[model samples]
Target chain A: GSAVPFHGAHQAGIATPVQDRLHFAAFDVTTEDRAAFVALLKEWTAAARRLTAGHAVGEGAYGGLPEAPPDDTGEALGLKPSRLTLTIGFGPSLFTRFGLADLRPEALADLPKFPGDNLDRARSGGDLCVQACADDPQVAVHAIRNLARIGFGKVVVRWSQLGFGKTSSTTPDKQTPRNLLGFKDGTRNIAGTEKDRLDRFVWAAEKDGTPWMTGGSYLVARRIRMHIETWDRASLQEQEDVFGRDKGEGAPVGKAKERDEPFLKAMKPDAHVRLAHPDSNGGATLLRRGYSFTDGTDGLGRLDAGLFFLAYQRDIRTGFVPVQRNLATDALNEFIQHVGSAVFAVPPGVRDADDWWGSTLFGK
Target chain B: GSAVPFHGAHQAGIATPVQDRLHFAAFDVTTEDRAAFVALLKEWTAAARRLTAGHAVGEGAYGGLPEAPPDDTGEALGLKPSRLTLTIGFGPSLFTRFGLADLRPEALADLPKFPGDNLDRARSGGDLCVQACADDPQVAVHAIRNLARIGFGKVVVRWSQLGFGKTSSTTPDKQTPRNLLGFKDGTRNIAGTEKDRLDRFVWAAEKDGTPWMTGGSYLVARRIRMHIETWDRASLQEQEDVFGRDKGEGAPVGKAKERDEPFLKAMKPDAHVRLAHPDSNGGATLLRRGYSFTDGTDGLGRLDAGLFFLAYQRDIRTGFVPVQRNLATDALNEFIQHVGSAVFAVPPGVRDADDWWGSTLFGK
Candidate 1:
């Protein structure tokens, strides 16, 4: 199956004023007295605005209906109710307080995350978020200080998540978007548009029950650790076949068009490119929004880096689950293992709305 | 200088959420079209909320001044910010991502900062907050994912910014409230009480600020990389005489009671400690919030860890700066160096108020 495009909607880093990176820290102070917690959150966020000299990215509730149009200034927006996640970023220079030295362009490609198939539903629950880049580490630290003052009970603060590939020859190589292997992963995927409605609908389904949940999204944070040295040592042909792309351009093998690598043709039983193929049953499809990370040395001589895969869909059974099942038995599984996996029944957006998923599943 | 407590005031964390950390690729969408940039921020934050489960944290933004009291439930009671700052105990778990493996606790006392002061200011100017922390490996990865989705911008992420002190004792030990350094840190600090005028003043000052700005707080993140080896190599007499306390208990040398360490005695030239004397023009005082982190190995067999220090005050001149300056030339400065520092002028809390800080500061 083809990949989904979480990367196409927004121009990455294109709409920015300052070229530096940014970082921030927030908490899901949602406890028994949520009213009080909201008050506290308001305070912390305002403080964040002042501390970093930045403004709230926008203001809206999490449980609001999906159809709620974007704010008047086109600034404020919101999400649904399953779990409210808030994040901010800083430029590269802010690392002064957190002590993230050796931060470089290449370092952006070496973050950490839960391995694919290893994401746990239980562990993935809660108001956990990370806002880090090679950007201003100081601003990031200040944001953390703002939240820490109000008290982050049960809040887990992290510096950043990892991107997948760095040294590979494929599209994700040296880029923040890549899969478990070092090669540029995700050569073919869907981009959103009226023309690609069929393909987009396959992964990103729109339903009437979620009007307020329009821009409200789905997430799939898959933590997949990769064996870099082992993969690097593989034969050229073996590596290409496993990744289902050309060893040189990461272009699909035996395919003419650069973006038209035939998934079906690549999935032949005896073909060298059957490694990442889907199973006999229809394969799964998920919108992938993942980054690469290097979680420090694993105590051995080898480096530890992996992809933090995030996906979204109207239905889990039809979207992420099936795709993951196909990859499970693929040839690539030998080089990679799913150490962490999770499935969060994300609620509808929060703005002028209540919890749609919450009401649907739990009947609250 | 000894530390002093500012009561009833709040503080904020110094980092951004998860999702925003990744969008900071500096991929410029437009430079002058601030409106368009704001729109993109709205979308990014929307996606971030679903990913991190922000709703699970709280229900809604009180929409006005918080009428309820701060949460004082289970762990919230004991985990007051003051206590969290003072009684912080760190172990190997803190250094997991630094990758030092097994450097002794004391040996791995300092970690690297993001490499600059004013990191927050720089990044916010660039609009890269969300993408920064999303890339860090040392901190939690999930946190980055959630924060990024919320369009959290201009983030400032960091690790511990607590205080530190070293003992001259030959035997290895954990620094306690009065162990490693001498001359108790905060002797005259007030307790939390209704009659405490200091608390009332600080609270009122904070409350008069903005609404998005309440429960709002201040953050002072400093990366002071200590020369632990140099301090460790110092003589017992030099260390004790400089700190004006017993090298072992950090209590006033020759004093009978821990609290009875006479400030006057430490000042007299003939006294055991002459430099730290309170009556002198350089007597120092400021509350300390800090943590010790381990930097990985250096070319030499030297270990690196230092205090990431932060001090919260209603006024920097009276609350933090004077004390810091008084201690600047004190014996502690002989061992500690101010490698990085930045002071942020945090606005007051917002109580359902709109754009209060803008009006207050710029008179908008």
Candidate 2:
């Protein structure tokens, strides 16, 4: 009952219920040979199928081999599946590495540097990324570590981010999570059950000039560092003015409940909710599955904590780009900075037991 | 039933069952005035009481104050307490800053450099430390961030570590958790209900040199990095020989069950279990509550992952020091390195609402 179906029309993690924890890893492909890289991908896919099915990567041979690395690294041996979903994504650079640049989706463009962006190169850009989501952090971590282990000779990790408190949910009927700035976000996000909206704004189409990404989606990962100390110092009214939502009920301006429709005009012009509202940006929507992170301190006196914002859409050009650009005037920008950014084209899921991840893009 | 009492004879975290997550932080006292520092500690204790009791720090006045920082950061607003226990301790460096250097506990000495120790100064020592354990990592993190928020000008975080998989369990009746290495650790650990063992091997007595630490305990924190990539490639038999236990059953050599008494002589002379056994060390024991961690990559195509070892005992002089010294001959030593180390004298828990943390050491 805990396991979600791994084979579907689209990847699991995108529409899958946002798990309690995430271990998202970005890796740079080191191998120049196309076949070698694709072979490793097949190995990873075969391993992930078992991993998501509540079995160890090489369960039969884990204790069998004495000289080889266990198919899995072993931390998740007794751990439940915890609804683990390992979603693979190809970055813009990935298409360039293989002879598959022509098959690259035009919608999968790199995120533009927005206002108040203080980007860190070390944390940005990769040839591939694995978004491992699970109710248990250890399971998610185990999945990533084993994948890294499997791809040891093919690729190396570029940067990785771990998330503790989930900031957004695919199942909106459940409790909405709060970001580090203490505001309920993604209230207007596309729910997993909304197939109509998903088809319209989230999932890529065959007629969209990318056949390999027919059932795919575009992902925008932004590590937004919130200055909590600065935000914590703001007055109750001032904080509300920036977010345009009540702290207690998460009701937007002029709304009495969290799920109530927001009256954008009642909020400040530069309010976060008002600017990010789909109504304000051509009705363009994004399915957000973000998580909160606090990584030690900033070498200064403040905690380096914020929202690792992840948004999935049919096209980044129409979805995130315009929305983020409109947010150039946002008042919330003063309290947060986008530090890391990455964009990935997530191909459709494995169709059957024999299918592997990225089969659509690099299939035989 | 989930809430662990915050006010106790000793502290909740030491004897309490190990939680699923950990957010261990060490802080440096920056303020010169001792009174200011003491006042902050009092404030932290008061806030901790509310935090651990499933209540926000400044519940009533949170919405009342329009001009000031809310007494508590609001991210944990609707979340359950998650059985959070906040335990505070004073390091050897803490005494040097405050004028109460004479009151330092004799057993709270700095940890000596052990074999294969590669300490990083940034992650090593601290003037004060707070070990926050909780069922939900968000709750544990909330506890620490609020403490940091509360101690704004008085102290700053020197270093912090977040743990996902727990390596040790004080309650062994439940499922024994696996570390990153895939081996079940802490099978012979003293359970939380074992009060006699707690008193003899864990808690400090009034007759000890420092009266303030009467019912308290000493803690040794070591950030041990395991060369999992290297260990994973070893043969199953060789790996089993190194740990002195079968990977699947976690049973000792010449034993059939996980909890069966280990025949130390049956294991290799330099195996981890043989060297760490209390019998090997002079009947000295440590109540460990370690957690596994992975901080991205090691910059050399390997995961920077390992165990964050936390051990509490009656006295470090007869506890962690001698035990670690014995481990110098351990074969497991070749695959692990102690990167960060700190020794702290944990003060007794707050007796009631009137009593604050460190009250016994700093009189009102």
Candidate 3:
């Protein structure tokens, strides 16, 4: 297993700082209400900015981090709320790296898509960004309400990473290993390493963007729901065949090596059933960061479980999306259903990694 | 405003017993190792089911309600799952003065909508019901696993009647209010009155089916997520204009009489905007029985809130669907975005007023 901390494993009740829960709200404003909404939003942003100064940032739940030093000199990235992706540059100097003499037009345009490498605009274009956040949902609601008094196109409220009490962690490796189905899951996994990150996360060359972003990552969100009762009726052997590996030792069924059962060999007869045989479709991989949520019970006896699978990579076409398409028609499709889904940009890090504005990437 | 017990007012917990958190590990049975997956799932289900039964029947949670000798016998029902509306009969033999002959399939089908309806279907269809409950997420996950294994199509897990504890008797005077975004949520709601027995619910009259179903109710599921942040951004006056009612008490804006604010009047000015108004669209009206959810967070500073509006009516054409269509481009559309949505037949209640079934309508 990789040495870097997984999400929650190393930080069980350990005192450490953590990210606050990100809060967001979306509203649909009448054209008449647009000016009012914009004006109110400006006021709320001012208050939020004032509040963010010296705000108590955290690394996790158990402990609190020191207060952030005030930096009024930093320009306020005037992030107008829209249902569209937000782009921020590390000042004007960073633009030259990408050969963009002026970052304004390019930044306003959509980011480049993979495979075609064309800078096509996103289909679901609207203003989006963090409005405000606090531990309380009501506080977030109130802030959004103030903005609502004005005119707005649409308002969406949300919060970012907070320590989930008994469930929070320092890194992905540190997190608990349970699938959405809650059966002491993840005993078998394709362990990630420095090499994996170097090879899988990179695409094209550093000239396209920045080399630091090369070692960096991308984020993916996959919404899949499990059909528990149907799967319950299946035998254990069937489970192994679908996943193409043994649950106990974290290895291929008949092989001693963990990664030895390559996707090509696994698709052959006498081998594991290749639901989305990689050979038929070019092998695609991604670095995953997913979480499981428990939607409650229907009066019906059936159960629901699935992965809100998130992964990050330099490219979507060759990275996460293709792998999803492969798995879409796989045997696993029999047990899991894909429903709500979306993909977002993670953007490159900034400020010596300490001062990165992950939220700003979304124009919050 | 019909007179009836609005039982969902002040209850602090579930009224009808909810599904237990079932645990199962399903297999992709079409694979070579299907047998093993099946075996594991079988063992898991048996264990989980037994545990669930113990908890539910024990004095702690479900309070041994099952042991109280089933409240009614199975012979009293009037309809089957597939009973056609006009075919069912009602009369004094069913309850008081109303009978099957008085039942109007078309009118019965017309009612208000609940916010939580759509989500109910998503959870129930996907078998995620148990997962979307108050119990531990672990338990919910386990339950989902079992459901998926059984091959129940598109299971959805959701919680209902959260605004009030389960025991609050639903009544006209004590009717449950709509969500933060109010449009008389669930205006044409289901009734537990004698009129409801004849006018709305009874799917089968006296012709072919039994009589026990006379007073039974039907469940409706719809998934609707309101863009409240967008809605909130509108000025109170603008909001009143769009909804045709004041934002607070839902009283018609600029109108002296409560009932005098004809919904159509609001739509007259801006047909497109007024049609999209929440009040006219939902107020014209329908019964609602929906629930609220967090849908996690979007990591910005807002939230996605609104009811998964659901309403039950005897006829699909006259009830919820029409209201939805009227509100299709309603002014409220500015504040809400219809993402994933669906409709399902919430099978009529199986047991009598004081009883519940040992197995569900489809059989455990």
Candidate 4:
């Protein structure tokens, strides 16, 4: 469990055990040179491979030429792998600029404008993104910073978010964690060990969309700002009614244990659980990998904190779209504001040493 | 090391073994009601005691009145205390209100603006501050959020910073952690167990400042932002020269092991370590407790990241001032900018169940 293999049929982070920390970054391409951009991806891939294995990049941090810059930032030198995973994705905007519009999957269209989205344009979209997750916060930050270092002139970071206290769990053995609102989140999430469920809900089939994305999935990111000050003043009954679960036991409205099946009828009309349930959206399911974050404060004396919501699925059209639409009136909406949003198409993982990120889409 | 005692002669966080996570907040008094403010402090103290002992506040999170707000937020219900420590401080402004200006500690004055300061007023000052540290990020966040919850109308959160990967180690047994610049920080900090050193440099004596601060200390906070993109492009030689130490061993110039005495003459004239060393500042010493942070991006494609620098000393005149003054022209200034600053007089710890955070000063 200490390390997730970097090489796989699909990226590891999507289905990897949810880690405790996250350093997610979105970048925009600066150089129009296709070859240079491709070379940058290759360099990033090799560095990521070594980093995931808990090894230093190039000649290690110490013995390198004293006059040259060290290939890897040395902060992570003494740390373990911590089951780190680096997942890459391509946003819809990338297709228009790189002469690769034909390679863009039909399902990779821009996400529709959702109800009550106060999205900040600066934090909303990007051409590419990398999600780095690890049990140690330093290890996760080290991965993304080094990657950004290597892509110095070729790409520029558009936005990034550092998260702690993972709000979702991907494995059944782990207990569901709570969000800032003191409610259990993702208690009924899809587990990675469920192979049949993974194929049906997570991994994309070849016939489902573009060939380049055969084994890949779509990713949707939303920065949901929690009105914690308001929530904290809420009554226990009101909070439970909004979430449709017991705060301590994480049980459904009338259930006893965390894993008990939800009684949809027992929930309030606008309950978050009832609206977000799979049954409500025609069995739509998403593998959530969300994390909580607090960024300084809003100048008006309130915490600028919330959930960095992340979801992966076989197809966004059937996955995030319908489920989000159904939650337009979720009681939880009053206590949260959607401030940032983005959607990306993840390509198939590298198959061998000869491969690199985006190799399939670029026909490399 | 599971939990630090909540009651003592001094606050736990200042001298307690540094934890891996931090949730630091600065608050403002929004009400003119002195009784309400005092009541909030009492509530915070009781909650803090229960939290540090790994117990829920008031009734347990589940057994409390189902119709009322849970006495404690339940995120930390099943988790250990993780050596959680809650340290409170009173900024100079807090005294200006409540007719307590005469009781203010002279050492609690505002910090003088330093060179290379790009101070943001919003993140700079507060009437009060709380430092919560824990081995588990969730635990630390939980402690602070609940205090903020209980503080509803009397006090409002001015600004807060969430920190990960501690940048200093108080004990010799622990390895020094790296900062955002990939350099070890606070290799020679005053250890908590060194009673003599703490008395001389950290704890305030009756004759040192004001009578109310006899057993208390002064705290100085600075938010220093690291310019990662510019630093990454620098050569290894330049990086080592700026820091005045080997990037790999963390040893001073002309030294081999990390703990070896520094030969200041061997370092460059404007080196950071040489300028900030105690010897160069009239033998002044400070107990350092810093943490690394990343807050999205700077909108110009650069990381909004840096060190949340914290220091405790008997008097600010002899502790942080001389050290910072000497580093005004240090070569490392090119890579960092101080964006926020604050100073607070941290009162003596609560002695028993009858005492609260500022009991002696408030004459409760």
Task: Please report the candidate that would top DockQ against the real structure.
Answer: 4
lDDT of 2 by residue, B138-221 (tens): 788888888898898899998999986542222223788888888887788877789999999989998877888999999999
Residue range B1-364, candidate 3, lDDT tens digits: 1111112221111122211111211111122242333343334333333223212111222112433321111111111111000000111211211122333222223234434233233332321122122222233233333334332332222322221101112244343343445333322233444344325332323332333333322223444566755553444455556666543344454555333434556444543335634465453323444454444444443444544444444445545556567755456656655443333322233232232221122122
lDDT of 1 by residue, B1-364 (tens): 1111211223212111111111111111222343444454444433333222212112221122233311110111101111111111112232232232342122212223331322332211211222222222212232232232222242222221211121111111222322112123333332233224334322224244334223322333455555544553445455555556543334576675444546655443433234424344343322333333233222232333445454443434344444444454565655655555444333332212232221222223
lDDT for each residue of candidate 4 in A1-364, tens digit (9 for 90 to 100): 2778999889889888888889999999999999899999999999989989988776776667778888877878677787889999999999987798788888876788888889999998899999999888888888988899888889988999888879998887887788877777878888989889989998888898588898899999999999877776677888899989988888998889989999999999899999999999999999999999887777777777799999999999999999999999999999999999999998888787778998888876
Interface RMSD, one decimal, each candidate = 28.2, 3.4, 17.3, 3.2
Which ten residues in a row are the worst by lDDT in model 1 chain B?
B71-80
TM-score, every prediction? 0.38, 0.97, 0.40, 0.97
Chain B only: TM-score of model 4: 0.96
> How well does candidate 3 reproduce the true complex, by DockQ?
0.08
Of candidates 2 and 1, the better by TM-score: 2
For all candidates in order, the CA lDDT equals 0.33, 0.85, 0.34, 0.87
* Highest lDDT scorer: 4
The stretch of ten residues in a row with the least summed lDDT in candidate 4 chain A is A56-65
* Candidate 3 residue-wise lDDT at B82: 14
Q: What is the TM-score of chain B alone in each candidate?
A: 0.50, 0.96, 0.49, 0.96
> Could you tell me the lDDT of residue A109 within candidate 4?
60
